[PDB]
Amino acid sequence: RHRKVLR
């Protein structure tokens, strides 16, 4: 769900 960095 919650990413640390942009995909």
Place this chain on the structure above:
Amino acid sequence: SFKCVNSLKEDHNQPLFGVQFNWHSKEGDPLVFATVGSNRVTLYECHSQGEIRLLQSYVDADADENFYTCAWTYDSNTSHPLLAVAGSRGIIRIINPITMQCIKHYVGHGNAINELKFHPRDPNLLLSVSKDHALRLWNIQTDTLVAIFGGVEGHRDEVLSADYDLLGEKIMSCGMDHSLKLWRINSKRMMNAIKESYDYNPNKTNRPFISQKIHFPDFSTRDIHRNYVDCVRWLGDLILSKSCENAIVCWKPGKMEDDIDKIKPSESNVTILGRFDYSQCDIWYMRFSTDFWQKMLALGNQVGKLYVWDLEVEDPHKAKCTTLTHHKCGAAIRQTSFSRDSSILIAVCDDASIWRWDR
């Protein structure tokens, strides 16, 4: 009113996760800030015409280390500034900023350290928050672990941020469990623990230093955000916190009229005093900062836009927002830092760039 005067990029091309101006820099010395990213910490000096003068870095012996956070203090005997750094290895390094020598280091945490904060009144008291779900309070004069804030009733996932209140009487922490927790460090137990930490000299005794195990917060809420809480700051007796939900919430424990020092661990209520909305900050580990006086609040988003709120108004919800954009600043901003005199604002990014804004 801020204008962008310069930018640069560090050679490692990895995210810069942290930036901090040295608010303990001496009168007549130039303004200095540290950046942390990859396995390094770098110092820069601010000069006229937007010049950002590169000084010297500390590079960790371990290529797999990743520094996430830094915090400035000073040596309480000599007055010389010190820089604490930490990241994925869960090792705190105390760095001499002049030579960039690692003076000493502290191991303990079960994992990555997500944030470091120094006590507002005592330059020796360092707080670390960890992926291992705990906070640790260290005394960097006597090299003692004062207390561990953990347990079943503590955080149940990574701790991402924490902040001391004005006098350093209490800490608010937050993390991946969506919760914000209060830990009072002015209790009889904690005040005695700090005093004993100062009396401890391993060369004059047989005993190890005994750490406090603090297993119960003095307040806890999961009613503010509905995702990872990645940044928290006291605003007097009020709290500012954010998640990855495009809002900073201003709130307090208990009901509107409830005194913070009268709040009991069983407190079920919170009061929402305002909310500062913004855009495109859906990723976590994105930190706001305030100036020395707490007149302003700055946050960068995931596409390189800066939001600045003027808090010099009668109520939290009346804060005045201003935005700062640059056409070549398109990477995620992880953290901001004001110089102590508020003349300079620095933003650091995921593409290793550094952006200088002058007032």
